[PDB]
Amino acid sequence: LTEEQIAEFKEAFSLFDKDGDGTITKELGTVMRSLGQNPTEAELQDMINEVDADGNGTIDFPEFLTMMARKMKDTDSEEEIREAFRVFDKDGNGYISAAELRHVMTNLGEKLTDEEVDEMIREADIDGDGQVNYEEFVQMMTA
Template sequence: MHQKRKGLVLDSNGLFLFYSFIITLVLIAVWVVWLWNDKTLRKKYPGAKFLSQDQINEFKECFSLYDKNHKGKIRAADLLAVMRCLGVSPTPAEAQRHLHLHKIERNAELDFSTFLNIMYRQMKQEEPEKEILTALAMIDREKRGLISAAELRAKLTRLGEKLSEEEVDDLLKEAKIGPNGTIKYEEFTRTICLPAVDY
């Protein structure tokens, strides 16, 4: 004797609705997990608050390559290499200054949160630096990396947001003016773009 099975029988419309419902639940679950991870990541790494999720992921991936012992830390000596791998261009002195600012010795280690803060600081420093370099390169007609201090003074006091003579004097104190009255503008730009140290 055959027993008839009792249960739900779905036609093609019913299957479509059922699968749509399942897909919707999965998408909601993925969104909730992403949102939770995003908030958790930002709580865990305070330096992340100014960075996009894509930037954090990229930084984490590169950081992990240098985290040889899988402790969530890199050697301070590797900081310059990791930063340059991520497209910023600190000098060795700038990398050392970042370490000093966070009270990290050259032979010590730094965690990912500290690294995010350092990367953010370096990126903010390099933004105006590029604009200033572009403007100064336009003055450098011979493309030697040098500009005349007198010409720079004239541009700063007559164009754009005009500076006073005193402001230009203060600015030029930061410049290493050569014996022929010229300034290496890349070095000068780096100096004036150093972020203020927070104490």
């Protein structure tokens, strides 16, 4: 991380820090968004859960700095691609199945019709054998 970027991060951090003790208030997610990076509600909620302990006037810059290192605009997500393969595989199938994907889809409020779940799986299956392991999802993420 260049000194220029870290200075910009602290600049915004202080701009949103009303405590004056190098601790933002509510405006932690706002520093996040203003700093170019635009996290989704889920990403933000998750980050707040990370700083749920204390926070709101106890969020130090290093704390926010560690948070953004975990996800510098989500440039490096490989560490959590295998994690999501494990999560998606709720029954630990070991391969991508339509039922668990459809479950995940419905859990996101997306009620994909089997027809769509099907295209999804068909595209996910490189060899089209009905089973999609870590490698196929990793190839999709590289595409």
